[PDB]
Amino acid sequence: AKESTGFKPGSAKKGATLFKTRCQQCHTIEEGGPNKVGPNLHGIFGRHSGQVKGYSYTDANINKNVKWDEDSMSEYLTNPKKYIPGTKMAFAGLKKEKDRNDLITYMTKAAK
Amino acid sequence: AKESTGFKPGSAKKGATLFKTRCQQCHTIEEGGPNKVGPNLHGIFGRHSGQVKGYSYTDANINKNVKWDEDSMSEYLTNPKKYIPGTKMAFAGLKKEKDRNDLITYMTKAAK
Ligand code: HEC
């Protein structure tokens, strides 16, 4: 629910730091970075869920076929399991809206 | 409602022809095409509503701030006025789902 989301741009600075303290443990975002616990996120926005080559996803994520946009990412980050029952991503999610906007700001930039 | 949409790839061939008999009257999709009744659509997918330079949009579309994805485009095409009360785009919309998938297929390709 994109509209619902109505995602607003935030602090890319801020996003940068939430990435490190929260997604870096398991993911890279750099162009040409490798998979790790989670898959490399470079190019995420221009792609559906479950397609980075050489990464083994759950049927759940593959089947989910999400077209990752910022409204999409926003739901998913509040509760990944909730957005994708069966996913193996282990993280409670980002509950504050502000948090998610900052992050997605960075992501949107870093991942391009 | 992307999920709802669950947009499936269709016939780009088919999409090509529905573009001509239906959107070409008012739009171009080619990279570097000009505005006309409607704005040039090249790059649509990577953009929000109301940002092609030199085109005069209604406050309605500007204000709508749509992040054009394929799920987005799908709602909009069933009833643009419905998706954007106030818009000046004059077209009843594409009622059959099949129609919309074909079109969006092309669009997604042509507009890149
Ligand atoms: C390790 C404990 C993780 C942390 C911290 C974060 N994520 Fe993750 N991510 C992890 C796994 C195991 C998986 C795959 C799940 C599966 O079921 O296959 C993922 C997947 C993602 C995805 C989907 C990618 C796709 O190509 O479909 C996204 C968009 C994602 N992860 C983003 C993300 C962000 C932004 C994080 C920080 C808040 C984050 N994840 C944390 C494991 C882990």
Ligand code: HEC
């Ligand atoms: C002329 C009678 C039109 C035809 C046929 C189609 N569209 Fe159109 N389009 C038209 C106008 C006057 C406008 C702007 C409306 C406003 O309120 O400003 C538009 C706008 C669009 C948009 C939004 C673009 C943006 O940058 O925000 C899209 C995505 C769009 N039109 C697509 C589209 C397609 C795919 C069509 C064929 C089925 C189509 N339109 C028909 C005018 C006219």
